[PDB]
């Protein structure tokens, strides 16, 4: 690790799946929200992510609530190896150490540094409030 990234923009994307059908949940949603810019070693906890998802859920889908988390994944920059966060327990994610990102200047062929990014992507099962899970009893 030669040139440690100086910052990591943590972006967030979440997909919501209703326990029983609803059109408003059009598949294909593709947006990210910048959560914050942190430093290598800073942490983000599952409770903080839940708060983020619940608030996003409130804006886009009033009347629904988080039922349960299905998966949480972090993709670091354009790196192929992703970190899979624990599925059924609270967790903390530490901003992974990394080499400072850069691209090659087309004209000069010299290196120009750019911001490193973490893309945290989650999926939660949601429920219309008032409603309950299950099938016809179990």
CA 96 to chain centre: 15
Cα three-residue angle 118-108-110, rounded to 5 degrees: 45
> 49 is in which domain, residue-wise?
1-138
Number of domains in the chain: 1
CATH of the domain at 87: 3.10.20.180
CA distance 16 to 64: 10
Strands 83-84 and 92-94: unpaired
Q: What is the resolution of this structure in A?
A: 2.3
DSSP string, 17-63: EESS--TTS-TT----EEEEEE-TT-EEEHHHHHHHHHHHHHHHSTT
Q: Which letter, b or e, does each residue of 14-35 get, where b requires 16 or more Cβ atoms within 10 Å of its Cβ?
A: bbbebbeeeeeeeeeeeeeeeb
Please state, in angstroms and rounded to a whole number, the distance separating the CA atoms of residues 3 and 6. Answer: 8
Name residues whose C-beta falls within 8 Å of residue 107's C-beta, 6 or more positions apart in sequence. Answer: none
Experimental technique for the deposited model? X-ray
- Rounded Cα distance between 33 and 3, Å, is 27
Query: Please, are residues 117 and 7 in contact by the beta-carbon 8 Å criterion?
Result: no
């Amino acid at each position: 690790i030669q040139n440690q990234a100086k910052s990591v923009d943590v972006e967030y994307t979440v997909q919501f799946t209703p326990l029983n059908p609803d059109d408003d949940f059009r598949p294909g949603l593709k947006l990210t929200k910048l959560l914050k810019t942190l430093a290598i070693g800073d942490t983000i906890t599952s409770q903080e992510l839940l708060a983020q998802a619940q608030s996003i859920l409130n804006k886009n889908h009033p009347g629904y609530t988080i039922y349960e988390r299905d998966s949480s994944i972090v993709t670091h920059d354009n790196d192929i190896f992703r970190t899979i966060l624990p599925m059924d327990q609270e967790f903390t994610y530490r901003v992974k150490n990394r080499e400072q990102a850069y691209r090659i200047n087309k004209k000069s062929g010299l290196n120009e540094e750019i911001n490193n990014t973490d893309l945290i992507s989650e999926k939660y099962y949601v429920l219309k409030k008032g409603e309950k899970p299950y099938d016809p009893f179990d």
